[PDB]
Design a protein around this nucleic acid. Structure first.
Ligand SMILES: Nc1ccn([C@H]2C[C@H](O)[C@@H](COP(=O)(O)OP(=O)(O)OP(=O)(O)O)O2)c(=O)n1
Ligand SMILES: [Mg+2]
Length: 426
DNA sequence: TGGTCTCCTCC
DNA sequence: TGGAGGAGA
């Protein structure tokens, strides 16, 4: 198998939170700007950065005071604060706009707030039967890059738009259109549809996005990041060997952490391509049966993880960190914040019930204690029977009350997390 | 480092 | 009728 059975796209919103704030406030459009939370501490922590601001070296998690040193004219929008904490409602509602448009075209898997995988196989087939064997014009692909192209010989390729076009021209001239079963053709038609999905998103919301088109989710996701912002990339099966030959392992989705580090360390390699020299059994012996098989196929551009038909979140939660000296040290402090979180949760749950005809049946409560390395010190669950903040906050307190070893609380709490899960039809 | 989150696997 | 952790938005 060559892993060419599907056409898969991944659509990803450009500097998402920034665009949401720029739509609402025209003064921020086409300028260096960032989205911050909690203005009183070092100007706020940056959570999203415009491309104009990135050119100055501004990144996520920079304090805005520090970002102003790199970019003096940097403009800022603040996350809404409600019930004593950052509130992301605006961005979740903006997300809904985008997901709904995309779901008119095909089955989506909502992977995050601002990205969805699209399974385009069927849409591609139908379109190929509609076209009537007609040639594909370059005008149908005005923002598409073909990864690996242009190659060979040929005052045009000096500028980026010039390169894109020569690349696209070479691809289209070489396309055999008379055969409806050609994976390259399928991908091309898949890219035509994504141009239309992206045009629809921009028309109906004003947000711009990037997209990757390939044969699986991982290559689609890799493809998408190759030409940002506001552009889409086709990564064909044939492009993989050259692409993978200098592709750092950590750039592939799910290899950005400890597992990716172990591949590099154990095998003595740098690049995704280098993985081809190892047998499936060799990879299985190092990283386990599932990862080993996954890597064997992946380094050859083959992956089988399906686009799951799901556009609603499986969990609805909210949390607050209480770092250093702000750590919660009294029973009444703990009960107060549990109530704030519960109240926001109640509102979001109630909305979710009316919107999507479903109820959460489990409440998960998670905490961190001061001086614990781990990201969580304790997760406990209970039944969620009523969408009632007072009940949910009191029940949350019950199940964690045993952690106190002192009405003082010790050790102090650095984190609270309430999460509603286990949805069933209502 | 940061902060408010979601999805997944392992045992 | 679970809880810890990894990996990413
Ligand atoms: N660690 C993170 C990552 C993301 N986000 C939020 C803010 C982002 O705008 C949105 C989407 O995340 P992306 O990783 O897609 O980043 P952007 O959309 O901001 O930039 P890009 O244009 O590179 O996708 O999720 C966040 O709060 N914290
Ligand atoms: Mg994005």
């Amino acid at each position: 198998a060559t892993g060419q059975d599907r056409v898969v796209a991944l659509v990803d919103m450009d500097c998402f939170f920034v665009q949401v704030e720029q739509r609402q406030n025209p003064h921020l459009r086409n300028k260096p700007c960032a989205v911050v939370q909690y203005k009183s501490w070092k100007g706020g922590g940056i959570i999203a950065v415009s491309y104009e601001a990135r050119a100055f070296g501004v990144t996520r998690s920079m304090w805005a005071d520090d970002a102003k040193k790199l970019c003096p004219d940097l403009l800022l929008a603040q996350v809404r604060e409600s019930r004593g904490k950052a509130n992301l409602t605006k961005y979740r509602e903006a997300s809904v706009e985008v997901m709904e448009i995309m779901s008119r075209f095909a089955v989506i898997e909502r992977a995050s707030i601002d990205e969805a995988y699209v399974d385009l196989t069927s849409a591609v087939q139908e379109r190929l039967q509609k076209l009537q064997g007609q040639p594909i014009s370059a005008d149908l692909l005005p923002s598409t890059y073909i990864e690996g192209l242009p190659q060979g010989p040929t005052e045009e390729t000096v500028q980026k738009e010039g390169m894109r076009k020569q690349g696209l021209f070479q691809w289209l001239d070489s396309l055999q259109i008379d055969n409806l079963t050609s994976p390259d053709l399928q991908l091309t038609v898949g890219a035509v549809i994504v141009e239309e999905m992206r045009a629809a998103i921009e028309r109906e919301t004003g947000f711009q996005c990037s997209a990757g088109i390939s044969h699986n989710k991982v290559l689609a996701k890799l493809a998408c990041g190759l030409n940002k912002p506001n552009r889409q990339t086709l990564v064909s099966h044939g492009s993989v060997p050259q692409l993978f030959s200098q592709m750092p392992i950590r750039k592939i989705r799910s290899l950005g952490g400890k597992l990716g580090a172990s591949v590099i360390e154990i095998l003595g390699i740098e690049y995704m391509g280098e993985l081809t020299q190892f047998t499936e059994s060799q990879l299985q012996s190092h990283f386990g049966e599932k990862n080993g098989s996954w890597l064997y196929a992946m380094c050859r551009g083959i992956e089988h993880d399906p686009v799951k038909p799901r556009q609603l979140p499986k969990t609805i939660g909210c949390s607050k960190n209480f770092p250093g000296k702000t750590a919660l040290a009294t029973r009444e402090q703990v009960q107060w914040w549990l109530l704030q979180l519960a109240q926001e949760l109640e509102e979001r749950l109630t909305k979710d019930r009316n919107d999507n005809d479903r109820v959460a049946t489990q409440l998960v409560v998670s905490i961190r204690v001061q001086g614990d390395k781990r990201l969580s010190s304790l997760r406990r669950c209970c039944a969620l029977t009523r969408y009632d903040a007072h009940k949910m906050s009191h029940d949350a307190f019950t199940v964690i009350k045993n952690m106190n070893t002192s009405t003082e609380w010790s050790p102090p709490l650095t984190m609270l997390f309430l999460c509603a899960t286990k949805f069933s039809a209502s």
